[PDB]
Amino acid sequence: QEDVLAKELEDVNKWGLHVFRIAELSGNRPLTVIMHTIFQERDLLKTFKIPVDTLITYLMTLEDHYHADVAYHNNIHAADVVQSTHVLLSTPALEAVFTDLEILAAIFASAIHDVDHPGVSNQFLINTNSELALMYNDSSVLENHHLAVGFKLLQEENCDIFQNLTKKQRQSLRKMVIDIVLATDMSKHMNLLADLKTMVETKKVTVLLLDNYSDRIQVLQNMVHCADLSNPTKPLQLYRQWTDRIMEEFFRQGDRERERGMEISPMCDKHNASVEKSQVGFIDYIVHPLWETWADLVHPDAQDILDTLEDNREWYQSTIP
Ligand SMILES: COc1cc(-c2ccc(=O)[nH]n2)ccc1OC(F)F
Ligand SMILES: [Mg+2]
Ligand SMILES: [Zn+2]
Structure with a gap:
């Protein structure tokens, strides 16, 4: 089983990694093994003097704080966003652009970006007067929480992976990570995209x-946002699994809403939903505009990713008539 896991991990630098298989083969530790593999591949343990034991302890702790009973926003999604960010960071158009600290920040941010996700949206948390919404004043409720948890876990025994970073490095990394994770809030998508488009229009090579x-942080924010919204750009067998999972999560939120006598949120009503129309809309209005812009920034590095996205959109669309 360990040999088969090692085999699947050889694809860590590739778009389309079999993340679900890695989740099974690793004994439900996809985030830990993918993060460890990436840190080894990028030589981050030596660069930042991270003891291996400390890295593994923190990662397992972090992974434990993703909920096992949430269909989408779990440790597999975190591992997938981490690995996707890792591939985007290696794009030829960005070679030598980011410092080791910025790379570390982007990967760490991806790892913690949805930690302790309850499987319901910011709007649900706000509408139900939840403890989280009250704590965070209805502003990037989940994203603020993910950050707080991700950072707080560094304080557990043998969990401080940044123990050998200088104070200045820790200060800088903390700010970057906060800026990156806060940018994963979908309410910031339109402004983030408008700024990315401006960057493409004023691009210098x-x-x-x-x-x-x-500019650097803006690119990292958009990079991790692209990774977060990368499901429709993956091979179809992976994409369909992600769709099944997000719909399960949405339907469970709708069940909770219906029980409370609330109006059911878009796509959350299992009795009145069109999974296929929803994916075509998601791609047309959010994912494609973002990815086409990213592809323009790094042209032509992301052409194969954009082609896959377009093929998947056509596939989902073809199931509708
Ligand atoms: C896989 O598709 C979807 C994925 C997400 C998604 C992506 C990243 C994330 O963290 N949470 N949700 C949200 C909606 C989706 O589908 C569509 F119906 F809107
Ligand atoms: Mg999120
Ligand atoms: Zn996410």
Whole structure:
């Protein structure tokens, strides 16, 4: 079983990694094994003097804080976003652009980005006067919580993977990680995309040139956002599983809403839903606009990813008539 897991992990640098198989083969530790593999591949343990034992302890702790009974926002999704970010960071157009600390920040942010997700939306939490919404004043409720949990877990015994970073490095990494995870809130999507489009329109090359923090962090924010919304760009067998899972989560939220006498949220009513129309809409209005813009920024590095997205959109559309 360990040999088969090692075999599947050889594809860690590729789009379309068999993440569900890795989840099974690793004994439900996809986040831990994919993160460890990526840290080894990028030589991050040596660069930042992270003891291996500390890395594994933190990762297992973090993974334990993803809910086992949430169909989508679980440890498999976190592992998938981590691995997808790892591939996007390796894009030829961004070679030598980011510092090791920025790379570490983007990967760590991806790992913690949905930790302790309850399987319901920010709007549900706000509408139900939840403890989370009250704590966070209805603003990026989940995303603020994911950050707080991800950082708080570093304080557990033998969990501080940044123990050997300088104070300045820790301060910088913390700010970057916060900026990245807060950008995964879908309420920020339109502004994030508008800014990415502006970057493509004012693009300078030499490989991409990004001289200041605002531009670098903006690219990392959009990169992790793309990774988060990467399901429709993956091979169809993976994409369909992700669709099954998000719909299960949405339907369970709708069941909760119906029990409370609330109006059922879009796509959450199992009795009045069109899974296929919803995916075509998701791609047409959100995923394709974002990915086409990313592809333009790194043209032509992401052409195969964009082609897959377009093929998958056509497939889902073809099932409707
Ligand atoms: C896989 O499709 C979807 C995925 C998400 C999704 C992506 C990342 C994330 O963290 N949460 N939700 C949200 C909606 C989706 O589908 C559509 F119906 F809107
Ligand atoms: Mg999220
Ligand atoms: Zn996510």
